[PDB]
């Protein structure tokens, strides 16, 4: 028969629950969503199958969907991002969770497949982060497509895929771009990585940032956070970019912008925030400085040629889980973190719960949208109404004791807008 | 026939003005690159552009860029105190109809704007505005010229806000290009520009120290974002007010305290309004403020600080120097007003530096050229420049800063599904 | 009998030895000390008894002392700062070490006492951090005093104790104030906590810093470092000081400066860097927002009234090691870290090895000076010559690839100084 | 006798200077607290103080403070460009012998100082120096006045440096107090002061964009730290140069790149010498600078930049405006020099704001009182002020910033072993 779940140690449920209690008090968005849409169960009948890093933050989201009458089955969208105590807590809660830190490509695939069919029917809703789930159903379980009502993508890379599929006509089910919600990409990607990247490098290497020259590939919302994080600790940051705008942004901020070919000979730390392949190749590792720390924080491990290292390094010693130190022919060494997988989740705990509350509340609203108002979202990737976006940030103001100002009638008139309604044009960039 | 060829404060300043223009030029690669690339082409040939933008050394460079492109131009400042006399003299000497000077009166203001409407041979063809003052003047009092204008290009947030309002009500009769909302503008001019000019205007006017003082910044948009950081960098504790939950959540995540003006008015030692909205600082606030609290506005129109109240309420009002008034209230405390409520950077200083302005002005030039040569592509309404152009404005400036951009390899351009030259971000990207 | 050592599990030696390999490459100072005095063996005959946080950095220290021909016996200066794999590595190398994470007061004392007598006589030198060792001997083993050639403190609180002792003429052995060495106090205390403070709060709680209000008690080198870290992550930092000079500095940096009686009402995060007692009391706890994180970074755990919480809280749950969460009679909760002990070392790994190389390079120099030139240092607390101070700083320039400028003959004569000798007046504050 | 009672640019500027002083006094609590406490006691009665320090608004308040304490003063500036005419006017109108104006010549500089040696009642009693020129004039040309001078007061590092080199050679014949190395001075005036005044000078002189530029700051001392932090706060990439391994590591730990001037001279866009040393920027360096590179100095004396070389090698030299010259080398590239090498914060601006200057001048007034009231407490040499006085200086400025200082309790003070009022730090503390 099938397994009710599959975690590393159900025994961790105790500790994991203690952590969920703490994260809950830090995620007012998800809690404000609970108490409001609990007595109504707007997701009643929904059989949500999610694929997202099984962490304490995700655990609070999973229970929130449930609190809303939703039926759920989960898996982690990465073999190294799962938090066993958090996964156990959910497992103990009676939810079908299939994840654990340190899964093999095989087990990873298997884990997702275990969330495809519920006790009484296949999935009708999707909650993805990376696009791995949707890709599996569209390429291996097409039969389910018409059965699935909607989708909600979490990250940049996953959303990049959706548009691609829609533009090629491969996408056969509606989908809401959660990553590009203002209260997401401008907070999660930016502030979330501003605090999580350094944590991943720290727990893994304990290296001192100050005095070190760090190279950040790409200056998007993620790279902006990483660069700021490193600079704030006293590190000289260099940036690489392909977009003249982003590149000019980094320059206006006092960052040096050059190519990886030149920068590889200066960096003491390397972070890839690009969403594309071949960012750091052997040509680069060969010129690096002894004991240069290298990691990737992008969604997919396709930026650092970890393969070249294994097939070219003279020695390969593992310091501890997710931390390896290669020795090249030149005699110098290289430090690889999480085997190239997103370092903040692989070597640490990912973004703190507060910022995650922002993303996850967008996620919940999205599920409620593709499930309650299918007519508003036909086959194609859509954005969540700016009215809801503003609402998400609104829910997180109180905790920070922030006092929002209210537009008077005269003022609302003068500006031509509702003191309650949206405050910015859809094209606004924040 | 007695229409003056120009009208500045002192033609003698042209010499010193030209000097500043040569230096500024070597800071504005965008514009200069637009000249060498379109000088012989003369895309703006036949066009008669009538602009209404702050007559500064940076604007002068834009005026000559348009002229180098075979465009007939007549200019006027869009704010009574923003004009730089030596800059107007230089242009006035170049033989261009200039009507602007520091210290204009409401009367003279409107006058100047009207002295640019008719060129020696025909009405205006295009409208280069900043604030909407020109666009509105025509639409209401000179509607007969509407069908003779191939398009408008708005410079700032307030002006562009006005256009949309007109289009919504269908009151907008001539096409328009939203320049302010071009990434290489709003996210640069509004942000990095104010970050260096605000303190500049306050410093030149009061010389007050920022380190240690508490500063209140009304609004946290692109201008507020830059103002807050400028203040913060100098050691001042910044407090922000906001109506937008998102914007407010942004300032909090940046270590800023966010509250209402009603409460911040009792703490502030320096106040800066970055809102395009009225009624920000009122008597209620002035009465609570601290002794010698500095008050100023950096928004387009002087509709944020109720200066009228200060005039009709202070026990006395002294003038330390031009654009700097020190009122004394009944409570015995004093208040320092800058530029009589007008945008402080330009009113008390010299506005954004030349390098950054090159960005916005290059977008302005691409707008004129676009709205002029390709009118059969811009219906009646407000539009944005193609991201290809927006991106072009950025790259044109990388050189100066010696920025070495990376080129996508063939494999990468495929993996990402985009041209190694074509647009790099979707239309919804927020940078 | 006398155990040859005592650690948590010597099976961690392999991992500890690896952690040292990496560390040795991050501490140029200590390594330049070995290659320069290896054959010289200046510390020959010296029986050094050390009492300092048994960590990866401290391990590289001990091994340096040994390379210089000294005999060493070690113990930690705190019950929670010991890093087991680092303590194990040292134990396996034959170096007597009595330290493990999670000691008790009884075992703490016991550990120090195992380092008093060597396999061939009582201790010669005292490498202490906090005064526990120098105080233990001056009060229980005065007969060993005349046999001790010198003492070298490490931290502020400890050096303070030394002065207080000399003043009352209780100090019966020449000591060198290492902490107040420029390359120490202005780097270790400052940049060190700037990276380690947040590190300790995160591994323990994973809380988001951005948005929170943080109250840092005190504004000294440590206070400065912590404060900068917190606001670097987007937290609003409120300071509390008793020294008007330090207070003006904070205000000139943009920090609000009030009393704890005031701040205890706004703080979401509390960090005490004061060197004294009674900073956060029950009166304060009763007013902290729900789930306020309170920790201490001062040497001794005398800044936070942890007893009060235990005898007044209506609930107390242990999330995990060094992480307790209480619930007051008012219903609001409080998260205490390391039971009030220095959090950076109790909840993390202390400062990164690079900045510690600075501190420890001075420590070794202090041991050599005191042991090699006993006469040159009579009974009392002394500083290290500025020529030596600059030497330390200059030894780490290479690693960061810094190009120091050499004064020309003309320039040197103009400035009235040697192009090699001291570059600053003795009262220079940097 | 023809000795003029004063000599200023335009005493008709006094009206405006007085206004400036009004605002200034309200920003200098320390200086006003001094008079507010000794106005009656008149502790400086009988003192004939001759001060040689940048005649500015801040300095004006300093002078009026001493006068309020019963001292008699004749003043002169210690730099040919740091004088602010309207300020020098106010003091003049107030009936105080002041010889200084903006634009002086070496000859007039020497003259201006000598006019402050003899008072109506005879030779000077006290010295208030900044740079040491006055103390050097007396010691070398008027050694017969030495036995008549009680004490000296050095404001800046350079001067203080001279006092030691003098005492060391035993050529210092009068007790002097090192005011610069007082915590409330060097760790506030040099650091935070320049952090706000360096840019100000650069801006008013050039209006250049700081964001995106590469800046090179020679020296990482109290001034270097301040300047560097300011520049990068605006988005400039700051490269540092140093000869002291400690300072060098400090800058490196702050994320600054530290190389040699020989290298940085090839990639800098803005140069700022904050060293008190010679030969920092030479012709070999100029010849490698990027086009239109702005070069300036903020060190006391103009000896860091080889301005002489520029005049004797450039093929073109155009003066844009006072204190702003643009050269063109044989390599075809241009170079913007400010204030001809003199301290740019005062040469092209208004120096440090009034607030922080209060910290410096408070120690100044304090030193005078000490040196004049307790002469026996200071043998021949150079000393610092008691730490308890330093704390008092800072504490006197907490009020305006609204800082709530904390008081040690009985138990606390006992545990720490220090008076809940007495000095809080050991003599060697570095803050
Ligand atoms: N680990 C996390 O917590 C987290 C959080 C959010 C997003 N992400 C991931 O981060 C990535 C992208 O960042 P964003 O999400 O900030 O998106 P952008 O902001 O979409 O991201 C990438 C940036 O890199 C640049 N770039 C692309 N190819 C490059 C090359 N070869 N060299 C140099 N620069 C290049 C682009 O011009 C762009 O500015 C995705 O993979 C996304 O899924 C991770
Ligand atoms: N002086 C200059 O150099 C310069 C340069 C660019 C723009 N501007 C002007 O600055 C203004 C707006 O800034 P942006 O940055 O252009 O636009 P947003 O970024 O459009 O601007 C205003 C911000 O203020 C907030 N706000 C609105 N009403 C408020 C109220 N009553 N209280 C508190 N906050 C309120 C909004 O939510 C928004 O975040 C316009 O007037 C524009 O023309 C001046
Ligand atoms: N955990 C670590 O890594 C580390 C590293 C270095 C020092 N320390 C410890 O930090 C402490 C002191 O810091 P420093 O930075 O070493 O020394 P200072 O800089 O000597 O330290 C304390 C500061 O707190 C202030 N202060 C004292 N009592 C106060 C009170 N009741 N309220 C508010 N402010 C008060 C003082 O004015 C002073 O500025 C010592 O206990 C020292 O051993 C810890
Ligand atoms: N204009 C102002 O407002 C103001 C205010 C305070 C001090 N100053 C002046 O600033 C100067 C010194 O600064 P401080 O900050 O006073 O003193 P430090 O802090 O004494 O000053 C200089 C620093 O430069 C370094 N240095 C010396 N020679 C060098 C060389 N050839 N190359 C590279 N680096 C070198 C030293 O190692 C030192 O750290 C003096 O001239 C002083 O009078 C000006
Ligand atoms: N602690 C965390 N818990 C859950 N999800 C997280 C966390 N930190 C970051 N993420 C997400 C993650 F990985 C990516 C990019 O794929 C996102 O865009 C985020 O939503
Ligand atoms: N120095 C300057 N020169 C010319 N135009 C400037 C300058 N500084 C700011 N601005 C413009 C200005 F005023 C507004 C808002 O109305 C803008 O949005 C800018 O383009
Ligand atoms: N990782 C570390 N390893 C060893 N010692 C450290 C570390 N981080 C900080 N310290 C010391 C510590 F604890 C105190 C205060 O007592 C100091 O002053 C430091 O030398
Ligand atoms: N606004 C100002 N007013 C008076 N003196 C000032 C000012 N700004 C800086 N200084 C002094 C100055 F010039 C030097 C270096 O010689 C110092 O060290 C300062 O005290």
- If we measure between CA atoms, which residue out of A186, A176, A192 comes closest to residue A363? A176
Proximal ligand: closest to the CA of A242: 1
Q: Which residues lie below 8 Å from residue D243, measured CB to CB, with a gap of 6+?
A: C404, C405, C406, C407, C419, C423
Residue B428 lies in a domain: no
Tokens of A291: 């004991």
A143, HSE (Cβ side, Cα atoms, 13 Å): 6
Q: What is the CATH number of the domain that holds D322?
A: 3.40.50.720
Do B12 and B152 fall within a single domain? Answer: yes
From residue A215, give the alpha-carbon distance in Å to each of A190, A305, A341, D127: 17, 16, 17, 54
- Of C317, C350, C383, at which residue does a domain stop? C350
A132-140 and A105-113 helices, crossing angle to 10°: 70
d(CA B18, CA B3): 25
d(CA C64, CA C62): 5
- B340 DSSP assignment: G
Residue A236 lies in a domain: yes
From residue B298, give the alpha-carbon distance in Å to each of B59, C231, D349: 18, 27, 23
H or E element at residue C399: helix C397-400
Please list every residue in chain A followed by a chain break, i.e. its C lies more than 2.5 Å from the next written N.
none
Do B250 and B385 fall within a single domain? Answer: no
SS3 assignment for B215-265: EEEECCCHHHHHHHHHHHHCCCEEEEECCCHHHHHHHHHCCCEECCHHHHC
- Please tell me whether residue D324 adopts helix, strand or coil conformation: strand
Residue A64 lies in a domain: yes
d(CA B376, CA B245): 41
B 157-196 → D contacts, CB under 8 A: 192, 195-196
- Please tell me whether residue A197 adopts helix, strand or coil conformation: helix
d(CA D399, CA D392): 12
Q: How many residues does chain A have?
A: 430
Tokens of B83: 């004009």
**Chain A contact for D257, CB < 8 A?**
yes
* Closest CB from B184, B258, B278 relative to A411: B278
Cβ contacts of A354 on chain C, cutoff 8 Å: 207-208, 210-211
Beta-sheet strands, E only, within D222-341? 237-241, 257-258, 270-273, 293-297, 316-321, 324-328, 334-338
Please state the separation of Cα A183 from the chain's center in Å. 14
Tokens of B343: 């945008």
Do C12 and C82 fall within a single domain? Answer: yes
- If we measure between CA atoms, which residue out of C359, C367, C404, C380 comes closest to residue C183? C359
Cβ neighbours of B331 (radius 10 Å) = 12
Report whether B304 contacts B277 (CB < 8 A): yes
From residue B1, give the alpha-carbon distance in Å to each of A331, B93, B269, B373, B380: 86, 21, 54, 33, 35
d(CA A229, CA A351): 13
D282, HSE (Cβ side, Cα atoms, 13 Å): 9
Q: Is A422 left (phi over 0), alpha (psi -120 to 50) or beta?
A: beta
Tokens of B262: 């009603």
- If we measure between CA atoms, which residue out of B221, B152, B193, B187 comes closest to residue B58? B193
**Chain C contact for B211, CB < 8 A?**
yes
d(CA C362, CA C152): 10
Q: Is D196 left (phi over 0), alpha (psi -120 to 50) or beta?
A: alpha
Tokens of D193: 């002061």
- Of C330, C350, C370, at which residue does a domain stop? C350
Q: What is the DSSP string of C300-325?
A: SS-SB-HHHHHTT-SEEEEEETTEEE
Cβ neighbours of D273 (radius 10 Å) = 28
Task: Please report all neighbours of C, defined by 3+ CB atom pairs within 8 A.
Answer: A, B, D
d(CA A231, CA A245): 21
d(CA B199, CA B52): 25
d(CA A85, CA A20): 10
Q: In the PDB record, what is the listed experimental method?
A: X-ray
Report whether A173 contacts A145 (CB < 8 A): yes
**Chain B contact for D15, CB < 8 A?**
no
Q: Which residues lie below 8 Å from residue C144, measured CB to CB, with a gap of 6+?
A: C116, C122, C123, C137
Sheet strands side by side (includes A71-75): A97-98, A71-75, A47-51, A125-128, A150-153, A175-177, A381-382
d(CA C334, CA A8): 31
d(CA C387, CA C188): 19
Residue B418 lies in a domain: no
Phi and psi angles of residue D167, each rounded to the nearest 5 degrees, phi first = -55, -40
B102, HSE (Cβ side, Cα atoms, 13 Å): 19
Residue C54 domain boundaries:
1-190+351-402
d(CA C370, CA C375): 8
Tokens of B91: 């242009």
Tokens of C34: 């070995």
- If we measure between CA atoms, which residue out of D252, D244, D254, D249 comes closest to residue D277? D244
Tokens of D265: 């001279």
Report whether C23 contacts C59 (CB < 8 A): yes
Please state the separation of Cα C291 from the chain's center in Å. 28
Q: Which residues lie below 8 Å from residue C373, measured CB to CB, with a gap of 6+?
A: none
Do B221 and B347 fall within a single domain? Answer: yes
Residue C268 lies in a domain: yes
d(CA C164, CA D216): 45
- Please tell me whether residue C256 adopts helix, strand or coil conformation: strand
Q: How many domains does chain B have?
A: 2
- C406 DSSP assignment: P
Span from the CA of C336 to the centroid of ligand 3 (angstroms): 20
Q: Which residues lie below 8 Å from residue D40, measured CB to CB, with a gap of 6+?
A: none
d(CA D17, CA B105): 28
Residue B164 lies in a domain: yes
Report whether C274 contacts C217 (CB < 8 A): yes
- If we measure between CA atoms, which residue out of C142, C150, C98 comes closest to residue C124? C150
- Of B324, B351, B378, at which residue does a domain stop? B351
Cβ neighbours of B147 (radius 10 Å) = 10
Instruction: Choose one of A78, A132, A155 to mutate for the ligand 5 pocket test, by most ligand atoms within 8 angstroms of C-beta.
Output: A155
Do B365 and B224 fall within a single domain? Answer: no
Q: Which residues lie below 8 Å from residue A426, measured CB to CB, with a gap of 6+?
A: A386
Cβ contacts of A189 on chain C, cutoff 8 Å: none
D242 lines ligand 4 (CB under 6 A): yes
Sheet strands side by side (includes C292-296): C256-257, C236-240, C213-217, C269-272, C292-296, C333-337, C323-327, C315-320
Residue showing tokens 């270097």: D224
C206 is catalytic: no
C76 is catalytic: yes
Q: Which residues lie below 8 Å from residue B347, measured CB to CB, with a gap of 6+?
A: B79, B81, B82, B201, B323, B338, B339, B340
Do B38 and B168 fall within a single domain? Answer: yes
Tokens of A52: 């997202």
B222-233 and D222-233 helices, crossing angle to 10°: 180
Resolution of this model in Å is 2.5
Span from the CA of D300 to the centroid of ligand 4 (angstroms): 9
- Please tell me whether residue C47 adopts helix, strand or coil conformation: strand
Tell me whether residue B137 is exposed, middle or buried, using C-beta atoms within 10 angstroms of its C-beta: 0 to 12, 13 to 18, 19 or more: middle
Report whether A304 contacts A272 (CB < 8 A): yes
How do strand C97-98 and strand B257-258 relate by DSSP bridges? Answer: unpaired
Q: What is the CATH number of the domain that holds B66?
A: 3.40.50.1480
- If we measure between CA atoms, which residue out of D253, D187, A196 comes closest to residue C192? D253
- D275 DSSP assignment: -
Chains C, D: CB contacts within 8 A come to 160
Tokens of B168: 């919504």
d(CA A200, CA A342): 9
- If we measure between CA atoms, which residue out of D397, D394, D353, D409 comes closest to residue D29? D397
**Chain D contact for B32, CB < 8 A?**
no
SS3 assignment for D12-68: HHHHHHHHHHHHHHCCCHHHHHHHHHHCCCCCCCCCEEEEECCCCHHHHHHHHHHHH
Residue D255 lies in a domain: yes
H or E element at residue C72: strand C71-75
- If we measure between CA atoms, which residue out of B246, B227, B205, B151 comes closest to residue B340? B205
Cβ contacts of C251 on chain B, cutoff 8 Å: 212
Report whether D287 contacts D213 (CB < 8 A): no
From residue A148, give the alpha-carbon distance in Å to each of A44, A302, C166: 15, 30, 80
Q: Which residues lie below 8 Å from residue C45, measured CB to CB, with a gap of 6+?
A: C69, C124
For chain B, helix (H) and strand (E) counts, in that order, are 18, 17
Do C340 and C376 fall within a single domain? Answer: no
d(CA B99, CA B96): 10
Do B219 and B147 fall within a single domain? Answer: no
Tokens of A370: 């593709």
Do C152 and C15 fall within a single domain? Answer: yes
Residue A415 lies in a domain: no
Do A144 and A10 fall within a single domain? Answer: yes
Q: What is the DSSP string of B263-275?
A: HHTTT-SEEEE--
Which residue has its alpha carbon closest to ligand 2 atom 2?
Answer: B298
Do A359 and A343 fall within a single domain? Answer: no
Do A125 and A207 fall within a single domain? Answer: no
A284, HSE (Cβ side, Cα atoms, 13 Å): 26
Report whether C28 contacts C399 (CB < 8 A): yes
Tokens of B386: 């193609």
C351 lines ligand 7 (CB under 6 A): yes
């Amino acid at each position: 028969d099938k397994l009710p779940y599959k975690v590393a140690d159900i025994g961790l449920a105790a500790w994991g629950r203690k952590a969920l209690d703490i994260a809950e008090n830090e995620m007012p968005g998800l809690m404000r969503m609970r108490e409001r849409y609990s007595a109504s169960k707007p997701l009643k009948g929904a059989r949500i199958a999610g694929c997202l890093h099984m962490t304490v933050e995700t655990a609070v989201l999973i229970e929130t969907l449930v609190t809303l009458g939703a039926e759920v089955q989960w898996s982690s969208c990465n073999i190294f991002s799962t938090q066993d105590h958090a996964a156990a807590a959910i497992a103990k809660a009676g939810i079908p969770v299939y994840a654990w830190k340190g899964e093999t490509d095989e087990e990873y695939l298997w884990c997702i497949e275990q969330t495809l069919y519920f006790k009484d029917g296949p999935l009708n809703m999707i909650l993805d982060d990376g696009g791995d789930l949707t890709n599996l159903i569209h390429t291996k379980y097409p039969q389910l497509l018409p059965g699935i009502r909607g989708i909600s993508e979490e990250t940049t890379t996953g959303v990049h895929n959706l548009y691609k599929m829609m533009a090629n006509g491969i996408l056969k089910v509606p989908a809401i771009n959660v990553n590009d919600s203002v209260t997401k990409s401008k907070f999660d990607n930016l502030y979330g990585c501003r605090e999580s990247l350094i944590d991943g490098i720290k727990r893994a290497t304990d290296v001192m940032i100050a005095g070190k020259v760090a190279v950040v590939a790409g200056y998007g919302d993620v790279g902006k956070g990483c660069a700021q994080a490193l600079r704030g600790f006293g590190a000289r940051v260099i940036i690489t970019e392909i977009d003249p705008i982003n590149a000019l942004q980094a320059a206006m901020e006092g960052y040096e912008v050059t190519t990886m070919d030149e920068a590889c000979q200066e960096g003491n730390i390397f972070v890839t925030t690009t969403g594309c392949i071949d960012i750091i190749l052997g040509r680069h590792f060969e010129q690096m400085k002894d004991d240069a720390i290298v990691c990737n924080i992008g969604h997919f491990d396709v930026e650092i040629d970890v393969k070249w290292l294994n097939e070219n390094a003279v020695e390969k010693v593992n310091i501890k889980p997710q931390v390896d130190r290669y020795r090249l022919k030149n005699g110098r060494r290289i430090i690889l973190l999480a085997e190239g997988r997103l370092v903040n989740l692989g070597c640490a705990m990912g973004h703190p719960s507060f910022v995650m509350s922002n993303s996850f509340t967008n996620q919940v609203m999205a599920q409620i949208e593709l499930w309650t108002h299918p007519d508003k979202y036909p086959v194609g990737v859509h954005f969540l109404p700016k009215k809801l976006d503003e609402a998400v940030a609104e829910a997180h103001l109180g905790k920070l004791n922030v006092k929002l100002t209210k537009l008077t009638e005269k003022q609302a008139q003068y500006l031509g807008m509702s003191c309650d309604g949206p405050f910015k044009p859809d094209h606004y960039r924040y």
